[PDB]
Design a protein around this motif. Sequence first.
Motif, PDB file in Angstrom:
ATOM      1  N   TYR A 155       5.251 -10.343  14.373  1.00 29.04           N
ATOM      2  CA  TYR A 155       4.237 -10.841  15.242  1.00 29.04           C
ATOM      3  C   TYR A 155       4.220 -12.142  14.940  1.00 29.04           C
ATOM      4  CZ  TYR A 155       0.374  -9.342  12.880  1.00 29.04           C
ATOM      5  OH  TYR A 155      -0.546  -9.091  11.800  1.00 29.04           O
ATOM      6  N   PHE A 169       2.664  -5.623   4.031  1.00 23.61           N
ATOM      7  CA  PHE A 169       2.525  -6.742   4.998  1.00 23.61           C
ATOM      8  C   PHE A 169       2.578  -7.841   4.336  1.00 23.61           C
ATOM      9  CE2 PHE A 169       0.036 -10.407   6.128  1.00 23.61           C
ATOM     10  CZ  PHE A 169       0.008 -10.420   7.819  1.00 23.61           C
ATOM     11  N   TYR A 211      -4.284 -16.994   9.979  1.00 26.02           N
ATOM     12  CA  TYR A 211      -5.354 -16.075   9.595  1.00 26.02           C
ATOM     13  C   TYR A 211      -6.837 -16.581   9.238  1.00 26.02           C
ATOM     14  CZ  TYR A 211      -7.386 -12.111   6.773  1.00 26.02           C
ATOM     15  OH  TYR A 211      -8.258 -11.133   6.340  1.00 26.02           O
ATOM     16  N   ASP A 236       0.730  -1.156  -0.022  1.00 23.62           N
ATOM     17  CA  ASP A 236      -0.026   0.078   0.182  1.00 23.62           C
ATOM     18  C   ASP A 236       0.822   1.307  -0.055  1.00 23.62           C
ATOM     19  OD1 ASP A 236      -2.353  -1.471   0.461  1.00 23.62           O
ATOM     20  OD2 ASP A 236      -1.984  -1.866   2.598  1.00 23.62           O
ATOM     21  N   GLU A 279       3.543 -12.287   5.404  1.00 23.88           N
ATOM     22  CA  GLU A 279       3.318 -13.520   6.245  1.00 23.88           C
ATOM     23  C   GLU A 279       4.906 -13.954   5.951  1.00 23.88           C
ATOM     24  OE1 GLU A 279       0.611 -16.661   5.689  1.00 23.88           O
ATOM     25  OE2 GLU A 279      -1.201 -15.231   5.869  1.00 23.88           O
ATOM     26  N   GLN A 326       2.562 -19.050  12.380  1.00 24.17           N
ATOM     27  CA  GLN A 326       2.622 -18.223  11.362  1.00 24.17           C
ATOM     28  C   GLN A 326       3.479 -16.659  11.930  1.00 24.17           C
ATOM     29  OE1 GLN A 326      -1.335 -17.342   9.470  1.00 24.17           O
ATOM     30  NE2 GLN A 326      -0.757 -15.177   9.157  1.00 24.17           N
ATOM     31  N   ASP A 380      -9.625   0.112   8.830  1.00 26.88           N
ATOM     32  CA  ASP A 380      -9.421   0.204  10.563  1.00 26.88           C
ATOM     33  C   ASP A 380     -10.231   1.338  10.807  1.00 26.88           C
ATOM     34  OD1 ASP A 380      -7.781  -1.671  10.121  1.00 26.88           O
ATOM     35  OD2 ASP A 380      -6.275  -0.828  11.439  1.00 26.88           O
ATOM     36  N   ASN A 403       4.226 -12.782  10.841  1.00 30.65           N
ATOM     37  CA  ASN A 403       3.793 -11.727  10.117  1.00 30.65           C
ATOM     38  C   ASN A 403       4.531 -10.635  10.192  1.00 30.65           C
ATOM     39  OD1 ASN A 403       1.754 -13.247  10.033  1.00 30.65           O
ATOM     40  ND2 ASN A 403       0.173 -12.222  11.145  1.00 30.65           N
ATOM     41  N   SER A 459      -5.926   2.595   7.596  1.00 28.75           N
ATOM     42  CA  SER A 459      -6.278   1.697   6.037  1.00 28.75           C
ATOM     43  C   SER A 459      -7.839   2.235   6.273  1.00 28.75           C
ATOM     44  CB  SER A 459      -6.402   0.302   6.194  1.00 28.75           C
ATOM     45  OG  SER A 459      -7.029  -0.182   7.532  1.00 28.75           O
TER      46      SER A 459
HETATM   47  C1  LIG Z   1      -3.668 -10.129   9.518  1.00 31.72           C
HETATM   48  C2  LIG Z   1      -3.385 -11.066   8.392  1.00 31.72           C
HETATM   49  C3  LIG Z   1      -3.572 -10.334   6.789  1.00 31.72           C
HETATM   50  N1  LIG Z   1      -3.406 -10.821   5.808  1.00 31.72           N
HETATM   51  C4  LIG Z   1      -3.521 -10.177   4.478  1.00 31.72           C
HETATM   52  C5  LIG Z   1      -4.918  -9.697   4.299  1.00 31.72           C
HETATM   53  C6  LIG Z   1      -4.919  -8.437   3.766  1.00 31.72           C
HETATM   54  O1  LIG Z   1      -5.272  -8.140   2.312  1.00 31.72           O
HETATM   55  C7  LIG Z   1      -3.635  -7.807   3.907  1.00 31.72           C
HETATM   56  C8  LIG Z   1      -3.576  -6.609   4.708  1.00 31.72           C
HETATM   57  O2  LIG Z   1      -3.865  -6.836   6.200  1.00 31.72           O
HETATM   58  P1  LIG Z   1      -4.833  -5.754   6.713  1.00 31.72           P
HETATM   59  O3  LIG Z   1      -3.982  -4.878   7.732  1.00 31.72           O
HETATM   60  O4  LIG Z   1      -6.077  -6.585   7.411  1.00 31.72           O
HETATM   61  O5  LIG Z   1      -5.557  -4.835   5.725  1.00 31.72           O
HETATM   62  P2  LIG Z   1      -5.491  -3.153   5.724  1.00 31.72           P
HETATM   63  O6  LIG Z   1      -3.927  -2.705   5.283  1.00 31.72           O
HETATM   64  O7  LIG Z   1      -6.640  -2.677   4.848  1.00 31.72           O
HETATM   65  O8  LIG Z   1      -5.739  -2.719   7.217  1.00 31.72           O
HETATM   66  O9  LIG Z   1      -2.744  -9.122   4.485  1.00 31.72           O
HETATM   67  C9  LIG Z   1      -2.636 -11.949   5.929  1.00 31.72           C
HETATM   68  O10 LIG Z   1      -2.174 -12.624   4.555  1.00 31.72           O
HETATM   69  N2  LIG Z   1      -2.355 -12.621   6.982  1.00 31.72           N
HETATM   70  C10 LIG Z   1      -2.607 -12.283   7.976  1.00 31.72           C
HETATM   71  O11 LIG Z   1      -2.388 -12.965   9.150  1.00 31.72           O
END
Ligand SMILES: Cc1cn([C@H]2C[C@H](O)[C@@H](COP(=O)(O)OP(=O)(O)O)O2)c(=O)[nH]c1=O
Lengths: 175, 175
Positions: free
Chosen positions: B133, A27, B139, A22, A29, B47, B169, B49, B166
């Motif tokens: 983390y 983000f 997930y 973004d 895994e 997992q 959020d 992250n 985001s």
């Molecule tokens: C929390 C989490 C999110 N994701 C993915 C889902 C979302 O498309 C992307 C970003 O997560 P998220 O923080 O929920 O989106 P935003 O930036 O809009 O708040 O990461 C995972 O693949 N594994 C995870 O454990």
Amino acid sequence: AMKVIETNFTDAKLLEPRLFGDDRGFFTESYNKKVLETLGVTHSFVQDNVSYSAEAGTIRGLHFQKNPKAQTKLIQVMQGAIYDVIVDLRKDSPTFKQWRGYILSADNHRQLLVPKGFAHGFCTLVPHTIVMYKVDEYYSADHDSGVLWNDKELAIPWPVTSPILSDKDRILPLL
Amino acid sequence: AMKVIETNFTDAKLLEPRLFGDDRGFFTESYNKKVLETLGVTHSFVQDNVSYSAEAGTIRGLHFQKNPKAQTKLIQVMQGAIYDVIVDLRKDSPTFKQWRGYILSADNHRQLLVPKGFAHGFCTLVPHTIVMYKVDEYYSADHDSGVLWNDKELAIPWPVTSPILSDKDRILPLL
Ligand SMILES: Cc1cn([C@H]2C[C@H](O)[C@@H](COP(=O)(O)OP(=O)(O)O)O2)c(=O)[nH]c1=O
């Protein structure tokens, strides 16, 4: 999900995690047990180690923990970049004594799965490099061993002439 | 080895690993399954992250995954610093709706064990902060929930007036 960039010496795997970016950042895994098993990497990791090296050209290794406490490792770079080398020390292996140099960095987010039976070490390429790596067997100062970085049999092309090494690392045995 | 700095809400713990520093940098066991067990922390993490925030003042959270797929989270900061906040959402707890703010940084190496049943989020304090983390349940999209960062009941004195969030959020439901 996470994918395999290349496989060498039968079991060594250069991996890349799926990143989700973004304008705010990203983000990822960086580890998913069940995903790794699909990629033929089945290990239960018990410890995570973090190596910080203040100066570029710092050499960490070549390390290997002798059995019965051999360690499978999974390494990544969180800050900076390194030239990582692995050497196949399995005498039976067709690829015995062979090595390979990989560039792992904070920007490429690449990881290296170092199987048991291999020597592992790295050279930091820029200041303030932080390397993180998991191991599937606990540390044992008793079985902690290695291979001297400049062993002439391997003739590894390290990107440094006078590496920053600990005294312990300058007295590791030859191949 | 690892030390528990403080414990709150019966189960949430602020942890600190042992750090071996020398003239070349440092080495630390950021995670050790055996050690954590001796401290009362027992979980099978599946997992890891990573979250990178470009700018300071970015709030991620508050977040929890719905039961029966609740997740235990082990939070750490690899670069930069955060104001990390947890909220006890266990309806059957003597601290339900209480919260605590912690400062986790790449310089303090502190880690936070967030039990299942809590909402978790953080505000980056400097630019380019990297948070890592570990979780003990994968997930699960359908089980994704949270608390509004600026919810009126929660007192949370975030150190940012107009944070970076985001779209989802900003949409998170109120307690
Ligand atoms: C929390 C989490 C999110 N994701 C993915 C889902 C979302 O498309 C992307 C970003 O997560 P998220 O923080 O929920 O989106 P935003 O930036 O809009 O708040 O990461 C995972 O693949 N594994 C995870 O454990």
